[PDB]
Structure 1
């Protein structure tokens, strides 16, 4: 139907906007600490601690399959990256500290993303 096509164009345009959001958030992680899944070869107990791992490569795979229906879903995955890290790692670690800085800097980006999503519809 034509309605289904219009819905699909809306999803495509959200995907475009979320790709720009993802790029801007990933720039806030210049150490690439959050770029890839935590390796279960290198951290064998990880899934005992963290039940829903997340990372920017995993998000990018979902994004490119148009698997984010709205901005809430995307933000959920970004918050997982941060929150997982802040539980597994202690406060005095480069990993924790990177996550705090990513949260703080990413907030700015996400605030305007939400306005753009609502504004453009």
Structure 2
């Protein structure tokens, strides 16, 4: 509350460290469905169904240009990638599977870097 603060968690390395995680997600072999925005002209259904498209290249631009206020907002957009994937793709499909793999991969790096 006013003039009453929890001790200050050091957040000065958070930018760099999100950048590293994002690089590791960009280079994973199952990243291919998530590297670029889904083409809304060429994928029927996507535009109407997926209210908030996200992908790695959009995250990278946001990151690089100070559009994440903190590490949680960055995690939210990475998890949105995978939520969108689960919304649109059957679990038993290459893309469906890729999204589950990448989410597991991300969640582990997140815990090991920050928790």
TM-score of the two chains, using structure 1 as the length reference: 0.78
Structure that is richer in helix per residue: 1
Aligned residues: 106
Measured in 1, the distance between the counterparts of 2:54 and 2:31 equals 17
* CA deviation vs aligned residue, 1:6-39 (integer Å, no higher than 9, x gap): xxxx887432221111112223344511000000
- Equivalences for 1:1-121 in 2 at 5 Å? 13-115=13-115
- With 104-113 and 80-89 compared, the bigger mean Cα shift is at 104-113
TM-score of the two chains, using structure 2 as the length reference: 0.82
- Which residue of structure 1 lines up, in the alignment, with residue 5 of structure 2? none
- Provide the aligned C-alpha RMSD in A: 1.9
CA-CA distance at 1:70 after TM superposition: 1.4
